Amino acid sequence: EVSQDLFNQFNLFAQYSAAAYCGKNNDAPAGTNITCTGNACPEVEKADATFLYSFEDSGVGDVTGFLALDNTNKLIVLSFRGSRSIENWIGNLNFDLKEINDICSGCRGHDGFTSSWRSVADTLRQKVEDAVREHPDYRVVFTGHSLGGALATVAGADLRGNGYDIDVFSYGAPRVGNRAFAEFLTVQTGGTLYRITHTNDIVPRLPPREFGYSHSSPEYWIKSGTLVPVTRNDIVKIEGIDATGGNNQPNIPDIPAHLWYFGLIGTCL
Amino acid sequence: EVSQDLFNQFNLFAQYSAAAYCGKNNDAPAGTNITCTGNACPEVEKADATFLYSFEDSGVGDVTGFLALDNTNKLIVLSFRGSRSIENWIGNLNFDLKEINDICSGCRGHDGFTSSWRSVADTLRQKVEDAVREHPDYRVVFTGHSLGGALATVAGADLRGNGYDIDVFSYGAPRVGNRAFAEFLTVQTGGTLYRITHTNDIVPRLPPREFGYSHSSPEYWIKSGTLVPVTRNDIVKIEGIDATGGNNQPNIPDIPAHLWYFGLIGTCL
Ligand SMILES: *[C@@H]1O[C@H](CO)[C@@H](O)[C@H](O)[C@H]1NC(C)=O
Ligand SMILES: *[C@@H]1O[C@H](CO)[C@@H](O)[C@H](O)[C@H]1NC(C)=O
Ligand code: NA
Ligand code: NA
Ligand code: NA
C-alpha cells in the first residue's frame, strides 16, 4: 500500500545500512566509491556514491559508520553500524534510562545509545554541516540497522531544527526512550522517521515496555518471511504509539528475523 | 532450461542440504521431525520428514550429515554437510588424486573426499539399505552443499548398481576427480546426477583443472544473483565435460555466490 517510490527508498537505505557492516572501507580515504561484499548494496553501488568520512570505534560508546555523498540520488547519508556481535549485544543489552532534556523536555533515553551519540555528536554534526554547506539542495538522511538504527534516531532527534530537514530510516531498531521521547519522535518537525520492523524481530521489542520504553509512531512492518523477498503489499503502515499487531505482538520473537530487511543485513556473506 | 517439477526438486534438495548445517540434529534421536533455524528449510518442515540417522565427525575424514525419511515426497535422503569453516577449507584444500578403480576403471578421485567416504561407506550403505528394505517405493536421493556435494557424488558413484536408483543433487560442489571419473559420472546408469552451480561460485572451480581434475556433464547453472530469488528461467543446462560458460568462465570468483543456492546455504542466520 506504500508507493513504489517509498518502497524503493526503504530498499535503498536498507542497503546504506547494510554497507555499514559490509562496505569495503577499512581505511577507505575520502572520495572512494562505496562498494560492498556479497551483493549487500547493489543500488548504492549503481549510484555515484562516495565516502565523505569513515569512523570506527569513535567516542566512549565505540560508534562505527560513515558519511556518504550520493550525487545520483542527491543525498548526504550518515549510516551507523550496529554491533559486530548482535546475538551477544542482544543478550547483554542494559535497560537503564538517563534524562535527555537537551533533546526534549521530560524525555529519557537509553543511557548507552544517548551517551554514545553525545560522545561523537560535535564531530559528526560538523561533518554533516560541511556537506550541507557544499550541497545545500541535497537531502540529509540518517540511517542504520539495529544499534545503528537507535544511534541514527537519537542523532536525528538531536540535530534537527538547524535549517536542513533530517530524514531517518531505521531497520530493526530497539526502543530508544520513554513515552515522552516516543511522542517527540512522532511529532518532531524538520524531518520524518521511517521506523521499519520485520515479522517477529526481537530487537524492536527491546528494551521492554516494562523497563519504561515506548516506540514512536508510525511503524512500517514487513510481514514477508525471513529470506523471502519483500513486495510492496508486504509492508503495513501501523499508526499509534506502542501500537500492537505489527512487530509489537505477543508471540515469541527471533534473531534471524533481525538479519533480513529487504535482503541480508547485520551479517556479511 | 528446466521443468517446473525439476525446479521444485532443486529447491527442495537445496533445503535438505541447508538442513545439514542448520538442522536441530545435535545428538537428536531417530524419529525426530526435521526442523531448521533461520527459515533454512521451510519446504522440508512442511513435509512429514524425520531423522532416520544423524552422524557427526564420522570416520577418518569427520563426515557429518543425516539420513531422512520423507513420507510426503516419498524420499529417502542422505544429506552431507559441507565444512563448518568454508573460507578456511577453500584456502587449505589440497589437490592430491588417488586410484579409485573399485568405483570405475582408470578413475582417480580427490584423496580427501574419497578417503572420507570410504571410511563411512559400510555404515551408511547399511543405513540406506535398511530404509530401502522398509520403503521400496521411495526415491533414494543423496545431496549436499560444498564438501557435502562432493561426498554425495562419490557416495552415489560407489553405491549405485545394487538394485535401487540413487539420484544425486549437489550444490556448489568442487571437482571430485580426473577426466575418467568425470566421464563415468556423465554416463553411469542407476541414477541421475544433478550438479548445480551458481554464478561465479569459487568452489566448483576447485581443485583447478590444471591439477588433473574435470567436471561431469551436465551442469545446471543458476544465473540469478546472490541474495536474488531463483526463477525456473534462471537455470541453464550446460552440456559437455569441462564446458565453459556456466560456472566455468574466465572471471573472478567469490565466496558469497557459494552461500546462495535458492536461498541461504552453508551458514545459519
Ligand atoms: C566510481 O564511481 C564513479 C561514478 O559511478 C565511476 O565513474 C567511477 O568509474 C567509479 N570508480 C571505479 C574505480 O570504478
Ligand atoms: C511432527 O510432524 C508431524 C507432521 O509432519 C506432526 O504430526 C507432529 O505434530 C510433529 N511433531 C511435533 C513435535 O510437532
Ligand atoms: Na557507485
Ligand atoms: Na516530522
Ligand atoms: Na515436518
Residue numbers in the entry:
A (entry chain B), B (entry chain A): 1 to 269
What does the paper say about this structure?
Finally, we determined the three-dimensional (3D) models of this commercial lipase crystallized with and without phosphate at 2.0 and 1.7 Å resolutions, respectively.
In a second step, we tested the compatibility of both conditions with the use of agarose (0.2% w/v) or silica (2.0% v/v) gels by loading the capillary with the mix of BioL and gels. For comparison purposes, we also determined the 3D structure of BioL obtained in the absence of phosphate from crystals grown in capillaries with sodium formate as a precipitant agent. The advantage of using a gel matrix media, e.g., agarose, is then exploited to: (i) produce homogeneous batches of crystals (500 mL), (ii) facilitate crystal stabilization by chemical cross-linking, and (iii) to obtain high-quality crystals (allowing to determine the three-dimensional (3D) model at 1.7 Å) and to facilitate crystal recovery.
